[PDB]
Amino acid sequence: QRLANFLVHSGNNFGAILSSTNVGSNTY
Amino acid sequence: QRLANFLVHSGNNFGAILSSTNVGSNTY
Amino acid sequence: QRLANFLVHSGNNFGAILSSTNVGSNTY
Amino acid sequence: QRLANFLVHSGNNFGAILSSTNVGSNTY
Amino acid sequence: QRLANFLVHSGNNFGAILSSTNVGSNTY
Amino acid sequence: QRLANFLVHSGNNFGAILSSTNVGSNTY
Amino acid sequence: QRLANFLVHSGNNFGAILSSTNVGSNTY
Amino acid sequence: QRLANFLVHSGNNFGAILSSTNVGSNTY
Amino acid sequence: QRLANFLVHSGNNFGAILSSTNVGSNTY
Amino acid sequence: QRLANFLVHSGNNFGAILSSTNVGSNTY
């Protein structure tokens, strides 16, 4: 029913690849 | 029914590739 | 029903690859 | 019903690969 | 019902691979 | 320079009040 | 420079009040 | 420079009040 | 520079009050 | 520079108050 292929070539990663990230940084 | 192929070539990544990101940064 | 193939080639990783990250950094 | 294949080649890892991380860093 | 294969090749690991980590670092 | 006054009366709360929430719920 | 006053009256709380929450719930 | 006053009256708390919470719940 | 006053009245607490919590609940 | 006053009145506590908690509950 559902098929997904992921092929990634990374040299230098400082961020997010195939990832889920949550950051707050709130102020009261 | 559903087919998806992803091929990515990255040299230097400082952001998001195939990713989901949430940031708050709110102020009260 | 559901099939997913992941192939990743990383040289130097300072961030997230196939990961889920949560950070607070809130201030009261 | 559900099948997932993960193949990762890492050279130097300073972050997260196939991982879940939680950080607080909150201030009162 | 559910099948998952993980194959990882790491050279030098300073972070997390297939791991779950919790850090507090809070301040009152 | 900046002044804010918040006064809230809640009977029953199942959601968010003066809060910041992040949810992923992504699928690969 | 910045002044904030918070006054909250809660009867029954099942959610968040003056809080910051992060949830993943991702699937690979 | 920065002043904040918090006054909270809670009857029964099953969630979060003035708190920061992180949950993973990821699946591979 | 920074001043914060917290006054909380709780009857019955089953969750978090002025707290920081991390939970994994991940599955491989 | 930084001043914080905490005054808490608790009747019955089953959770966390001014605390930091880490739980794994992971499965492989």
From Swiss-Prot, chains A, B, C, D, E, F, G, H, I, J:
PTM-bearing positions, type Tyrosine amide: 28
The organism's place on the tree of life at top rank: Eukaryota
Modification after translation, per record: Amyloid fibrils are degraded by insulin-degrading enzyme IDE.
Places the protein is found: Secreted
Role of this protein: Amylin/IAPP is a glucoregulatory peptide hormone that plays an important role in the regulation of energy homeostasis. Selectively inhibits insulin-stimulated glucose utilization and glycogen deposition in muscle, while not affecting adipocyte glucose metabolism. IAPP function is mediated by the CALCR-RAMPs (AMYRs) receptor complexes. Amylin can also bind CALCR receptor in the absence of RAMPs, although it is more selective for AMYRs.
Binding partners and assembly: Can form homodimers. Interacts with IDE and INS. Interaction with INS inhibits homodimerization and fibril formation.
Family label: Belongs to the calcitonin family.
Domain observations: The mature protein is largely unstructured in the absence of a cognate ligand, and has a strong tendency to form fibrillar aggregates. Homodimerization may be the first step of amyloid formation.
Miscellaneous field: IAPP is the peptide subunit of amyloid found in pancreatic islets of type 2 diabetic patients and in insulinomas.
The name this protein goes by in its record: Islet amyloid polypeptide
